[PDB]
């Protein structure tokens, strides 16, 4: 009984860590190119007006 | 050294969630140690207790447990008269140590 | 046994990491050319500029 609830614990410690190890980069990185590509953005709108 | 001693099935891998530390149990502290191993630190196993090597003395036995657990259970048991032995990688290189023990004696010779 | 579960429940949590660079792998490459999408902000902005120069 108490050697299945810790195993059955441990699949607890499994799934806050399966929360950690899915939602670091996948909120980071969502951010990260977020400017990236607000960067491309703002790069382009620098020459496109040159070019008018 | 345990260069003979060592098998791959006697521990555990992928060491990034669960690890086998090799416990050293006395005999007369074996079953006192067999009533505790589960609440040695937390999220130990409570069913990887099982001994790997026995002597007159003492019994070598295999505990598994969590990467950052090792340290809350290697403390618990030095305060319950008990030893932790490291066992790595290394044991493939005590293997050539044993060959190094041969080369010894064959530099001697 | 306990030990045996633990490894491919772990594989669960390593197909969660997939998702990890998965959601960091398609989020990069659909809005990279969505980036490339205001180069059409871009074609009505010099088409109605052709006007001011007509």
Same mark, same amino acid.
């Given at each position: ?10 699949? %607890? ?13 996948? %909120? ?25 | 050294?345990? @260069?003979? !001693?060592?098998? #791959? ?17 006395? #005999?007369?502290?074996? /079953?006192?140690? !067999? #009533?505790?191993?589960?609440?040695? @630190?937390? =999220? ?17 036995? /295999? ?13 618990? @048991?030095? $305060? /319950?008269?008990? !030893? ?5 990688? /290394?044991?493939? $290189? =005590?293997? @050539?140590?044993?060959?190094? =023990? ?8 | ?10 594989? *669960? ?9 998965? &959601?960091?792998? &398609? *989020? ?14 871009? *074609? &009505?902005? *010099? ?8």
């Amino acid at each position: 009984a108490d050697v299945q609830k810790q195993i059955k614990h441990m699949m %607890a410690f499994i799934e806050q860590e399966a929360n950690e190890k899915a939602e670091e980069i996948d %909120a980071k990185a969502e951010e990260e190119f977020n400017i990236e590509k607000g960067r491309l953005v703002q790069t382009q709108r620098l020459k496109i007006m040159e070019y008018y | 050294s345990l @260069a003979e !001693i060592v098998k #791959k099935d006697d521990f555990v891998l992928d060491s990034e969630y669960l690890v086998t530390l090799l416990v050293v149990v006395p #005999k007369l502290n074996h /079953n006192d140690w !067999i #009533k505790q191993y589960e609440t040695l @630190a937390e =999220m130990v196993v409570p069913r990887s207790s099982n001994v790997l090597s026995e002597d007159q003395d003492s019994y070598l036995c /295999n505990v598994t447990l969590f990467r950052k657990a090792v340290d809350d259970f290697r403390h618990k @048991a030095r $305060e /319950n008269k008990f !030893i932790v032995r490291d066992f790595q990688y /290394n044991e493939e $290189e =005590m293997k @050539a140590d044993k060959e190094e =023990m041969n080369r010894l004696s064959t530099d001697k010779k | 046994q306990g030990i045996q579960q633990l490894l491919q429940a772990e594989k *669960r949590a390593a197909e969660k990491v997939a998702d990890a660079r998965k &959601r960091k792998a &398609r *989020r990069l490459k659909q809005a990279k050319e969505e980036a490339q999408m205001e180069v059409d902000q871009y *074609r &009505r902005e *010099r088409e109605q500029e052709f006007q001011s120069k007509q």
